[PDB]
Amino acid sequence: HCTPNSNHCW
């Protein structure tokens, strides 16, 4: 689970 606010988030 990545944060949608990071560029490295898928």
PDB file of all heavy atoms in Angstrom:
ATOM      1  N   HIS A   1       0.824  -1.203   0.000  1.00  0.00           N
ATOM      2  CA  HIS A   1       0.000   0.000   0.000  1.00  0.00           C
ATOM      3  C   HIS A   1       0.860   1.255   0.000  1.00  0.00           C
ATOM      4  O   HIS A   1       1.603   1.529   0.947  1.00  0.00           O
ATOM      5  CB  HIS A   1      -1.037  -0.006   1.161  1.00  0.00           C
ATOM      6  CG  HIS A   1      -0.488  -0.212   2.555  1.00  0.00           C
ATOM      7  ND1 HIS A   1      -0.335  -1.450   3.146  1.00  0.00           N
ATOM      8  CD2 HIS A   1      -0.093   0.691   3.482  1.00  0.00           C
ATOM      9  CE1 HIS A   1       0.132  -1.266   4.378  1.00  0.00           C
ATOM     10  NE2 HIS A   1       0.300   0.021   4.636  1.00  0.00           N
ATOM     11  N   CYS A   2       0.813   1.970  -1.086  1.00  0.00           N
ATOM     12  CA  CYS A   2       1.553   3.200  -1.236  1.00  0.00           C
ATOM     13  C   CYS A   2       0.636   4.401  -1.073  1.00  0.00           C
ATOM     14  O   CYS A   2      -0.603   4.270  -1.118  1.00  0.00           O
ATOM     15  CB  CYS A   2       2.289   3.236  -2.581  1.00  0.00           C
ATOM     16  SG  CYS A   2       1.232   2.959  -4.043  1.00  0.00           S
ATOM     17  N   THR A   3       1.205   5.541  -0.815  1.00  0.00           N
ATOM     18  CA  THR A   3       0.450   6.743  -0.729  1.00  0.00           C
ATOM     19  C   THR A   3       0.331   7.320  -2.144  1.00  0.00           C
ATOM     20  O   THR A   3       1.328   7.469  -2.819  1.00  0.00           O
ATOM     21  CB  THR A   3       1.176   7.747   0.169  1.00  0.00           C
ATOM     22  OG1 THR A   3       1.583   7.085   1.383  1.00  0.00           O
ATOM     23  CG2 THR A   3       0.271   8.919   0.519  1.00  0.00           C
ATOM     24  N   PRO A   4      -0.880   7.675  -2.597  1.00  0.00           N
ATOM     25  CA  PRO A   4      -1.131   8.203  -3.976  1.00  0.00           C
ATOM     26  C   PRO A   4      -0.382   9.505  -4.282  1.00  0.00           C
ATOM     27  O   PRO A   4      -0.369  10.003  -5.409  1.00  0.00           O
ATOM     28  CB  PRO A   4      -2.639   8.453  -3.995  1.00  0.00           C
ATOM     29  CG  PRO A   4      -3.187   7.627  -2.887  1.00  0.00           C
ATOM     30  CD  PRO A   4      -2.124   7.579  -1.830  1.00  0.00           C
ATOM     31  N   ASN A   5       0.217  10.023  -3.278  1.00  0.00           N
ATOM     32  CA  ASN A   5       0.892  11.306  -3.310  1.00  0.00           C
ATOM     33  C   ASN A   5       2.383  11.148  -3.589  1.00  0.00           C
ATOM     34  O   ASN A   5       3.112  12.137  -3.698  1.00  0.00           O
ATOM     35  CB  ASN A   5       0.670  12.068  -1.989  1.00  0.00           C
ATOM     36  CG  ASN A   5      -0.801  12.392  -1.706  1.00  0.00           C
ATOM     37  OD1 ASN A   5      -1.717  11.671  -2.123  1.00  0.00           O
ATOM     38  ND2 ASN A   5      -1.045  13.436  -0.981  1.00  0.00           N
ATOM     39  N   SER A   6       2.847   9.919  -3.688  1.00  0.00           N
ATOM     40  CA  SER A   6       4.228   9.688  -4.016  1.00  0.00           C
ATOM     41  C   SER A   6       4.343   9.240  -5.477  1.00  0.00           C
ATOM     42  O   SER A   6       3.456   8.534  -6.000  1.00  0.00           O
ATOM     43  CB  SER A   6       4.842   8.661  -3.052  1.00  0.00           C
ATOM     44  OG  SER A   6       4.118   7.453  -3.060  1.00  0.00           O
ATOM     45  N   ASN A   7       5.402   9.649  -6.142  1.00  0.00           N
ATOM     46  CA  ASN A   7       5.607   9.319  -7.557  1.00  0.00           C
ATOM     47  C   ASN A   7       5.938   7.852  -7.744  1.00  0.00           C
ATOM     48  O   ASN A   7       5.631   7.256  -8.776  1.00  0.00           O
ATOM     49  CB  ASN A   7       6.697  10.194  -8.193  1.00  0.00           C
ATOM     50  CG  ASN A   7       6.288  11.649  -8.357  1.00  0.00           C
ATOM     51  OD1 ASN A   7       5.683  12.030  -9.361  1.00  0.00           O
ATOM     52  ND2 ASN A   7       6.631  12.473  -7.410  1.00  0.00           N
ATOM     53  N   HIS A   8       6.528   7.263  -6.722  1.00  0.00           N
ATOM     54  CA  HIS A   8       6.923   5.856  -6.746  1.00  0.00           C
ATOM     55  C   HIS A   8       5.774   4.943  -6.313  1.00  0.00           C
ATOM     56  O   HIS A   8       5.952   3.729  -6.144  1.00  0.00           O
ATOM     57  CB  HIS A   8       8.167   5.612  -5.870  1.00  0.00           C
ATOM     58  CG  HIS A   8       9.454   6.210  -6.396  1.00  0.00           C
ATOM     59  ND1 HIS A   8      10.705   5.739  -6.068  1.00  0.00           N
ATOM     60  CD2 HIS A   8       9.667   7.271  -7.217  1.00  0.00           C
ATOM     61  CE1 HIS A   8      11.617   6.500  -6.675  1.00  0.00           C
ATOM     62  NE2 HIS A   8      11.041   7.453  -7.391  1.00  0.00           N
ATOM     63  N   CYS A   9       4.609   5.519  -6.128  1.00  0.00           N
ATOM     64  CA  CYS A   9       3.428   4.754  -5.803  1.00  0.00           C
ATOM     65  C   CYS A   9       2.834   4.208  -7.084  1.00  0.00           C
ATOM     66  O   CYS A   9       2.742   4.928  -8.090  1.00  0.00           O
ATOM     67  CB  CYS A   9       2.403   5.626  -5.071  1.00  0.00           C
ATOM     68  SG  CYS A   9       0.784   4.824  -4.717  1.00  0.00           S
ATOM     69  N   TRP A  10       2.461   2.954  -7.066  1.00  0.00           N
ATOM     70  CA  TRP A  10       1.882   2.313  -8.221  1.00  0.00           C
ATOM     71  C   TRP A  10       0.367   2.438  -8.153  1.00  0.00           C
ATOM     72  O   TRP A  10      -0.309   1.589  -7.582  1.00  0.00           O
ATOM     73  CB  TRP A  10       2.277   0.831  -8.268  1.00  0.00           C
ATOM     74  CG  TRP A  10       3.754   0.588  -8.215  1.00  0.00           C
ATOM     75  CD1 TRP A  10       4.480   0.239  -7.117  1.00  0.00           C
ATOM     76  CD2 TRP A  10       4.685   0.675  -9.300  1.00  0.00           C
ATOM     77  NE1 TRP A  10       5.800   0.095  -7.449  1.00  0.00           N
ATOM     78  CE2 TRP A  10       5.956   0.363  -8.784  1.00  0.00           C
ATOM     79  CE3 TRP A  10       4.567   0.984 -10.658  1.00  0.00           C
ATOM     80  CZ2 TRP A  10       7.101   0.351  -9.573  1.00  0.00           C
ATOM     81  CZ3 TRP A  10       5.705   0.974 -11.442  1.00  0.00           C
ATOM     82  CH2 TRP A  10       6.958   0.658 -10.898  1.00  0.00           C
TER      83      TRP A  10
END
